């Protein structure tokens, strides 16, 4: 027969992760690579559809994703939604394709709203999730001794689609269900440095284990005023949540990293105030595989849609498309073997989640819940050198931490700093 | 031909002025009336199709109106929608079927968000419209001679659909277009004592008429704190934004009415706090067609639907729904005369609005933008019983104030006070 798959993604604006200019290049591997395996739905033909998630500005909307969707349901009657990667309307998109029981794979959509799946019903996230993080923090606790308190701070701007609020929001609902410890959200205005003002004022009260999700600049302006209040590193510890590395020029391959250094003259101060801070970003996969699968695909995207893609940690989202679609090809083969058609919404779906698949980014493993356990890294400075690097690496299928290369993380005092002051607040 | 009419509207709640337990039978009463006339669609069977705009709380939400749109447009092919009327399941609908290209008819959704036809082509409001009430105000304005400043309160309540929000929202934008006035925006919270105190000491330094919009208590006990307070009605006027009339038992029918009179032992107070206060409600269709539409739909509501309602002004909305269907039902004849289709969208709308019709709310007008034309009534004390009625009437299509069987306005300084005192904040 002929499986359809109906893409709801932004088809004319190259500037998202998950943007059909990147993501396209993905699904056309994954599916060439269907066709050469006969192990894979054999003698089956798979066709994508495309639809646009995003309104007459190029920029994501809720109010057009759900027409796009709707439209693509009725004229072509998918089999499944490789639906949007957009907070906004993947909600939408995922409540209807829950209605009509057909399911939803995605690599965006890491709000912490989309994985009640009694709401959304057959999605799955081949993708990253912001409550996973809240399970490194919890595991990073845990290692060094923080029982009592900590601060998370996000920043707004007005371009962004509020992207550090749904961040700070999953990692605080996770972080605080896992463990007895008292966790203070907080929000400030990264455009005007009046807010800083208050921040520096308000921080050295109500935490000492501070979690921020400004921007890269907004972080070193904030970094240098606390080194200018004296908030040395033998008492703070400041964790830049910068998931896709772009304070690092995309955290991708092992090369000396300086993300204090602008050549604004103000530098050297710069380099003393990062001496207690600490990024967190997503990990690179580090298999050849990986390697080979982003050579061709930068390849095959400058050809097909006239797109140069820059090495960074975004082109995992491809990657998690790619291997999602295998994984939901593979569930469609095994229903197929077992007696079922390809619009069993619910027997393909739960051969999908709680199971491991081998693809571009390594072993993966789909929880139970239907969302997928992300691995993470910590970054630290070198006290001779200056310059970052990854020091910590996370499994989430295991949730543990390793040590990379020998190399352990550097402490002022040579041990963590209390998360409480010993005679303080 | 089969001309099929689709109805998203509470079909089990009962309790919202446009639930199908009092708009069926005004439906129903409609397509009795086109059959009866060969006047109306000459053959042509109309029936309609039923689907629910509530989530399974019993409430109408936003995210159960699309859906069931969807599945009615799918199966059933409609030429018409009677579009939902809560102001959060409208939206989606009519930018549904805005895509479409179908008709939406609606005597709810009175939002200013929902009249902006160029997102929602194609709907047709057939009932009151919050920004119409600015016009009101605009010509009471002028009449009294108030030209510097105004202040609008709005209640907050967690149970209704956030309702004075969106009341003062639209008086507020449409009379600030239509005025060269400074008018200004408060929010208090209902069910909050502390919040009537904390206003009455702002109130002073912000105005001097004043226009509140609240629940019959919350505005009675505030009106008894102002008492409290030397806050007398020879400086200031309190407007009471009551447009279904809950504070006059319905505001239908010539009787006496005392909306300070509650049976606690606060009364002789009350009576004195109410000498400051005028009440703003829709106004009563005064026409014998009218009074038969209700006394026939009271009898079929309760026989058809185990439902027995309770006369108001609430019953002005089954009965625009009443009335708009008739218009389109003519609209849509007059197409057929002129070689067209009943599935000329665009056709059919342009001949509803800019155009006049006689229906049982009386002679009504809908604008070129497609809203009716609201009527509205001015409600004032008498010195000498203490009741409240109706003093002044507002026709929409003319935009006048008359005064009714020569009552005039009851200032206890015999002129109003001014809205900027001498020598005044
Ligand atoms: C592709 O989509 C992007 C969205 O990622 C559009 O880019 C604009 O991106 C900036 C941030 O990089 C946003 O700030 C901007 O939206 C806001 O801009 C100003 C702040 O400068 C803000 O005040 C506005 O209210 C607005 O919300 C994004 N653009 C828009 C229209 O919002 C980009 O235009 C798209 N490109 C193409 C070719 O379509
Ligand atoms: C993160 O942790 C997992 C384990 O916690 C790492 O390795 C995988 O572990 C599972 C068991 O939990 C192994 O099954 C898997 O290796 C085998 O899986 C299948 C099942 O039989 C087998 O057919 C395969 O050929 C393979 O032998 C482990 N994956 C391997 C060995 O690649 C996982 O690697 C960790 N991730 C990282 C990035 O280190
Ligand atoms: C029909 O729908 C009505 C809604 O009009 C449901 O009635 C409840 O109405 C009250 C106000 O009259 C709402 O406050 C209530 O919703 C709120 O209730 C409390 C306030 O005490 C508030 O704290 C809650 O957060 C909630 O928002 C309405 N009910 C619900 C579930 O919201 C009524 O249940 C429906 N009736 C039937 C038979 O279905
Ligand atoms: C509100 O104002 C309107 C006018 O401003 C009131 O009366 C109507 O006025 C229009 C002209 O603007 C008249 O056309 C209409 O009467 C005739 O309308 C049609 C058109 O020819 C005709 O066929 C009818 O038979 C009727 O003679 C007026 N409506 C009437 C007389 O009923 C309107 O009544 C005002 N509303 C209230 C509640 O007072
Ligand atoms: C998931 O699978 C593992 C074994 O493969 C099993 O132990 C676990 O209970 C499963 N959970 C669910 C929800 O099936
Ligand atoms: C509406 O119709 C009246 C006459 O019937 C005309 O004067 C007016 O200009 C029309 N407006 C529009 C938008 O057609
Ligand atoms: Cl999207
Ligand atoms: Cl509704």
Same mark, same amino acid.
């Given at each position: 027969g002929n499986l359809t798959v109906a893409v709801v993604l932004p088809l004319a604006n190259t500037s998202y992760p998950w943007s059909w200019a990147r993501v396209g290049p993905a699904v056309e591997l994954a599916l060439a690579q269907v066709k050469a395996r006969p192990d894979l739905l054999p003698g089956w033909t798979v066709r994508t559809v495309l639809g646009s998630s995003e309104n007459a500005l190029g920029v994501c909307s809720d109010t057009a994703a759900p027409l796009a969707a709707v439209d693509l349901k009725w004229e072509h009657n998918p089999a499944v939604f490789l639906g949007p990667g957009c907070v906004y309307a993947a909600a939408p998109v995922g409540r209807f394709t829950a209605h009509w029981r057909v399911p939803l794979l995605t690599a965006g959509a890491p709000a912490l709203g989309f994985g009640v799946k009694d709401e959304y019903a057959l999605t799955t996230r081949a993708g990253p999730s912001y409550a996973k993080l809240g399970?490194?923090?919890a595991a990073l606790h845990r290692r060094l001794g923080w029982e009592r308190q900590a601060l998370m701070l996000y920043?707004?701007?007005? &371009?962004d689609?509020?992207?550090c609020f749904f961040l700070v929001e999953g990692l605080f609902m996770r972080v605080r269900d896992r463990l007895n410890i008292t966790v203070d959200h907080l929000e400030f205005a990264e455009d005007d440095l009046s807010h800083y003002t208050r921040l520096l004022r308000t921080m050295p009260r109500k935490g000492r284990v501070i979690y921020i999700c400004s921007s890269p600049d907004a972080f070193r302006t904030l970094m240098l005023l606390a080194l200018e209040a004296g908030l040395c590193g033998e008492d703070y510890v400041f964790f830049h949540l910068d998931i896709f590395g772009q304070s690092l020029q995309g955290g991708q391959g092992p090369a000396p990293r300086?993300?204090?250094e602008r050549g604004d003259g103000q530098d050297v101060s710069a380099r003393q105030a990062f001496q207690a801070a600490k990024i967190i970003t997503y990990k690179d996969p580090d298999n050849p595989e990986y390697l080979e699968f982003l050579k061709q695909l930068k390849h095959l995207a400058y050809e097909q849609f006239?797109? @140069?893609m820059e090495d960074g940690l975004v082109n995992t989202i491809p990657a998690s498309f790619h291997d999602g679609l295998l994984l939901y090809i593979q569930a469609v083969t095994e @229903?197929?073997?077992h007696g079922g058609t390809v619009t069993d919404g619910e027997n393909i779906t739960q051969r999908m989640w709680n199971r491991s698949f081998q693809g571009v980014t390594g072993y993966l493993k789909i929880d139970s819940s239907g969302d997928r356990e992300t691995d993470f890294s910590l970054w630290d400075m070198d006290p001779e050198n200056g310059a970052f690097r990854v020091v910590?690496?996370?499994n989430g299928t295991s949730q543990e931490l390793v040590a990379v290369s020998g190399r352990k993380l550097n402490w002022p005092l040579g041990y963590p700093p209390p998360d409480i002051p010993?005679? &303080?607040?």
């Open positions: 399970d490194f923090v920043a707004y701007r007005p &371009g689609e509020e992207h300086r993300p204090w006239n797109f @140069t @229903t197929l073997a910590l690496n996370y010993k005679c &303080g607040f």
